[PDB]
Amino acid sequence: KCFAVRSLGWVEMTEEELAPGRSSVAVNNCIRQLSYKDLLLQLEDETLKLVEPQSQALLHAQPIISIRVWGVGDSGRERDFAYVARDKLTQMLKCHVFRCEAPAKNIATSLHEICSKIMAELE
Incomplete structure (x- = not known):
């Protein structure tokens, strides 16, 4: 539900790169590119939040x-997490990359829970 992470930056992606089974490779090239701000990455309300630790200030909110x-x-590289979302204002596909304190699969797992509980709950 709430993970300490470090923002490494992002790389622009083409929509072609997201095509199935080209994406996995691609995201990987991205983590590679960016991985050799100290923030909290929260999961709450079908929303992925980036929050500033001392202030509790919402920095970013991704549905x-x-x-x-x-x-x-x-x-x-068990600690590198990435996700891809289209930017709200500027419209480009960005892939953001983060290095987390705990292993990065816990993040992936929770996003699957949150996802499932939505498909299911959508009857």
């Missing part, structure tokens, strides 16, 4: 359902 894909990096 889970418009996340295009996510990923966890390899070996000794």
Whole structure:
């Protein structure tokens, strides 16, 4: 539900890159590119929040359902998490990359829970 992470930046993606089974590779190239701000990445309300630790200030808010894909990096890259979303203002597909304190698969797992509980709950 709430993870300590470090923002590494982002890389622009083409919509072609998101095509199925080209995306997994692609996200991986992105983590590779960006991985060799200290924030909290929260999961709450079908929304992925980036929050500033001392202030509790909402820095960014990404609706889970418009996340295009996510990923966890390899070996000794168990801690790299990425996700892809189209920017609200400027309209470009961005892939953001984060290095987390705990292993990055916990993030991926929770996004699956939140996702499932929505497909299911949509009857």
